[PDB]
Symmetry: D2
Subunit: 144 residues, 4 copies
């Protein structure tokens, strides 16, 4: 089933100048970027986005890092995109991340782990609707 999932290139990814390399990782794996927008999140936006985790000890630090610089918001489309996205990102902890994943190659630490990806189809629908209107998502054919 063709699904859509949210991907966010965190502040450290832009600072390292690897936006293109990250997008290429998805493209080469068949995850088609159908929505992309560079944006600098406000505290209200980050908090609203991570609301279900407001009780976790990491919450506050997470929010501050996510608003410390601009991020690149994206919607990836493909067969089993939600899971495929998580595979390509790799384990949350870079030291524990598999070979060839984004976090293994680009992440700094568990706290500065370069990318975000929806954890489930259920959440993907919410995360996407949070950052994009349906009119901002555009599929296109892959050819040549």
């Amino acid at each position: 089933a063709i699904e859509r999932t949210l991907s966010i290139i965190k502040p450290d990814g832009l600072e390292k100048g690897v936006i293109g390399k990250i997008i290429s990782r998805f493209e080469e794996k068949g995850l088609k970027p159908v929505a992309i927008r560079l944006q600098h999140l406000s505290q209200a936006q980050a908090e609203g986005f991570y609301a279900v985790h407001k009780a976790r000890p990491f919450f506050k630090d997470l929010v501050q890092f996510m608003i410390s610089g601009p991020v690149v918001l994206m919607v990836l489309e493909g067969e089993n995109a939600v899971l495929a996205n998580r595979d390509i990102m790799g384990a949350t902890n870079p030291a524990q991340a598999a070979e060839g994943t984004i976090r293994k190659d680009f992440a700094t630490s568990i706290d500065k782990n370069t990318v975000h990806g929806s954890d489930s189809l259920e959440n993907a629908k919410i995360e996407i609707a949070y950052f994009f209107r349906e009119t901002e998502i555009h599929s296109y054919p892959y050819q040549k």
Copy 2:
């Protein structure tokens, strides 16, 4: 000095699945993407954007190609960005584009040449304002 210019990845660039390769081409040469937005242009948006070419013979075709699918709009910031961007893109005609340029590597024809770049600083300011609010452009420091 540091300038900001508009770059657009045309419909064919997305279809070829080389959005990342193109962006990397800029990043690796010091042209920082400070604004990015995937969008599908309407005919009125394309016509307004290429207004300066309204009298040119290729206009109608350019407009049709530019609205045939979505594009990636970008604002690149860097030293001598307007010229630098154009150099990296390569000659309009892929047939005569230099080695290592975006067009030589990805363009298929003159009419479907993968990228657009503002031709001058003055036009850059106009092209940028056409697609981006100042609040949509964000500079950030590199490592």
Copy 3:
């Protein structure tokens, strides 16, 4: 129950210069505008928006009118907002519209009837998501 519904001031409403009067009709009735954006719809956008009616004879004319000029997109919030919105708009046919409604006071004809409103809660969710990201909708208190 506090609900959110989509309202669109059609091209004829802007041409008559009654944007403010229309918004006032909602405000005075407790329907709070929590999202507003003036936009000129493309044919693709209008068609996608009215897709479920693509088989109806009115479809094509509807789409052309809806793209003939800019419109004002809005999300109204309030108790039973979906139904309240429909009450305030009035019958689709202005000649059949009740006293004090938007269509009775401002509409030209059944074809140029000034406003659009979600028909149900189910559709409101879809119409809103089509034109607005959740981050573009902002509730605020009514005071003074």
Copy 4:
């Protein structure tokens, strides 16, 4: 002649439920709303917007008030719009605002005065570009 200026309905205007009354005030005087967007400004957006007032004593407060809730951003188009808009708004201090002006009717205090209007054409161009892409501004004819 015809000009375009920026108008912002401050947080208190929305809280009072007079968005429509304010808009009607402009429409009825020939100032056509050609761009409208409800938005909640972040501190960085408010600070950047009021940069020219960074040294003024009211700056900090202005910024806090402007981000306390959402605002309605608008671009008004019409004959002598920059001055016309300012006239309709009325004096900054509601206490001395003229009869029939927006501030006399709706403003509660100098610091919560319901509306903002570009003070000059040059600043109008900058304020407009700060919040709107040219593609977000749409003129239309009246009846």
